[PDB]
Design a protein around this ligand. Structure first.
Ligand SMILES: Nc1nc2c(ncn2[C@@H]2O[C@H](COP(=O)(O)OP(=O)(O)O)[C@@H](O)[C@H]2O)c(=O)[nH]1
Ligand SMILES: [Mg+2]
Ligand SMILES: [Mg+2]
Ligand SMILES: [Mg+2]
Ligand SMILES: [Mg+2]
Length: 302
């Protein structure tokens, strides 16, 4: 409730003179409003959102000096009656790119974006892991996570699928588990939600089309390749290869094959969560995404 949000801001930060309040955006974890056209106030929607925010509160101050683009800097830190936090930060300027917006960038700008994104990812990968861990960033046991997923999928998802889709999923999980090249990695800090719905851009700039990056709630210590997952899903294979090349990846084919598997796993994880929530529209969406994934990977099987 936007009126209730305004009330908490006024009570806890009475010196903010509120002239305007509007809805700005919403995800699965947070509701965001814009105050005075300048300040984003972001309120967790769930205990999980609050736990992710507590991590961001500790991590983001450590990142600012290490990352070139702008990121949220929490200047106001509030508390709700249940004890969980909410935050206010100066709006990260620019227009949200979005999946739909990525397609139409002039190639010069696309290339500039690929370079900036490559540089951002390199700085995350360079951040000391123990420093992140001491700031409460969780360590993802990626191999065990995928093992557990494969089991939950066979049990809970397979009964909804036709035989061709079940065989496809069996093949994909087996591919990741069978080839040691895919499962050996040095753990690194990743953003964890690196998609164009979090890319703030200024299409009227040449050297720096990427203005900033938001939503660090999924930051984790994991396989750094996992940070390509939304680039491949939303921005496409060519773009992803361009970012990889700028980061100095010598084996593009192998790493694209690997990220593609992560994309499959993310899609089935999404469906599984929808299923557990008995959310019918979410399940329908998840099934469509799965069908699309299989079609996108025709021939990858052989
Ligand atoms: N333009 C702009 N939009 C923002 C900013 N912060 C949040 N938003 C919008 O609010 C939405 C929800 O914020 P987010 O941190 O992604 O929430 P979550 O996905 O639920 O964790 C985002 O997807 C953006 O659409 C900002 O600094 N600038
Ligand atoms: Mg988000
Ligand atoms: Mg989480
Ligand atoms: Mg988030
Ligand atoms: Mg590698």
């Amino acid at each position: 409730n936007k009126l209730h949000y305004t009330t908490m801001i006024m009570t806890q930060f009475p010196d903010i003179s509120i002239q305007s309040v509007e809805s700005l955006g919403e995800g699965f974890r947070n509701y965001a409003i814009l105050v005075n056209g300048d300040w984003v106030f972001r309120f967790p929607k769930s205990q999980q959102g609050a736990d992710e925010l507590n991590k961001e509160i500790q991590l983001l101050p450590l990142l600012v000096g290490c990352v070139k683009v702008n990121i949220p800097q929490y200047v106001y830190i509030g508390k709700r009656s249940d004890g969980n936090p909410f935050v206010g930060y100066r709006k990260v300027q620019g227009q949200i790119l979005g999946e739909d917006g990525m397609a139409v960038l002039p190639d010069d700008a696309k290339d500039r974006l690929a370079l900036q994104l490559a540089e951002f990812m390199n700085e995350l990968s360079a951040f000391p892991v123990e420093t992140a861990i001491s700031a409460g960033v969780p360590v993802t046991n990626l191999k065990n996570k995928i093992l557990l997923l494969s089991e939950a999928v066979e049990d809970q998802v397979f009964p909804l699928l036709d035989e061709s889709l079940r065989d496809y999923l069996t093949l994909r999980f087996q591919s990741y588990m069978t080839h040691p090249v895919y499962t050996r990695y040095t753990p690194r800090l990743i953003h964890g939600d690196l998609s164009p719905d979090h890319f703030l851009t200024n299409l009227n700039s040449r050297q720096t089309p990427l203005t900033g990056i938001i939503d660090f709630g999924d930051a984790a210590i994991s396989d750094p390749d996992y940070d390509y997952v939304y680039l491949l899903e939303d921005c496409g294979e060519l773009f992803t290869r361009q970012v990889m090349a700028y980061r100095g990846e010598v084996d593009l084919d192998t790493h694209i094959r690997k990220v593609s598997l992560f994309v499959t796993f993310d899609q089935v994880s999404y469906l599984l969560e929808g299923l557990r929530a008995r959310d019918q529209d979410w399940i329908s969406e998840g099934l469509e995404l799965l069908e699309e994934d299989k079609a996108n990977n025709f021939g990858a099987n052989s």
